[PDB]
């Protein structure tokens with residue numbers, strides 16, 4: 001009744017079990033918690049979910065077709081009983097303080113809370129986040145409209161007042177930045193009151209692999225093209241609610257062009273170039289307004305590695 005956790009999962013049965021165990025080690029009264037696991041028509045997860053059910057009130061929904069992370073999260077939102085919903089992607093983990101650290105804010109009058117994010121480069125558990133290898137963390141306060149510029153967190157970091165009660169859902173046409181579109185839909189479409197909670201963190205696993213052993217393929221260009229396209233899509237859909245954020249939006253195509261040129265020249269970008277761009281854009285939104293040529297230079301240093 002108090003909290004529903006929504007875990008969409010697709011051919012990751014091993015990682016799903018790590019995510020579910022991180023729910024089992026929540027410091028929380030399990031009487032007030034329901035877990036909804038949504039299999040997006042991948043390989044079965046009944047055994048994983050059966051195991052977690054020994055300690056949790058878990059429900060498995062089997063999608064009859066692969067609909068995407070948007071479709072699968074909606075499947076969970078439609079059936080969620082909790083006053084508040086907490087998203088968890090099957091390859092991230094909660095810290096034990098995930099709900100004890102956010103629920104006071106939601107009950108006190110927030111509708112939307114996001115916590116710090118540790119971008120973990122090695123696989124960790126819910127009780128072992130501090131053991132993660134971490135080069136960058138997403139800990140941006142909510143005082144400059146960075147969210148109006150571009151996405152600076154991920155669903156696993158979000159606890160929010162029931163989107164079904166608001167009639168607010170994920171857009172199934174978006175396969176990338178669907179979460180950004182959704183957060184803007186709550187914040188601007190439904191006037192959710194957003195609050196940052198820096199005392200709580202999750203682990204979001206971004207394990208490097210082969211790409212930095214090879215070079216930019218024409219698929220890094222294809223994927224960025226779709227990212228760029230959806231970014232323009234959502235920008236048109238949700239106008240910035242401040243003129244400063246509206247001006248800083250114009251830096252993202254500058255950054256995209258820099259990225260394309262690098263890819264085309266066969267030169268890889270920093271593995272965290274997006275997150276280093278967040279830091280540049282967060283500065284461009286505040287304090288004294290830097291010049292546009294200074295910011296264009298910082299984007300350069302951000303995409304290089306420095």
Ligand SMILES: O=c1ccn([C@@H]2O[C@H](COP(=O)(O)OP(=O)(O)O)[C@@H](O)[C@H]2O)c(=O)[nH]1
Pocket residue numbers: 007008009010011012040066067068069072073088089090091
């Ligand atoms: O067709 C898909 C692809 C992914 N997912 C789920 O959506 C979440 C986010 O997917 P992923 O981790 O690949 O997203 P990213 O971290 O790249 O945003 C995970 O729980 C996936 O299992 C899904 O339900 N259907």
Ligand SMILES: [Mg+2]
Pocket residue numbers: 089091092205
């Ligand atoms: Mg993921």
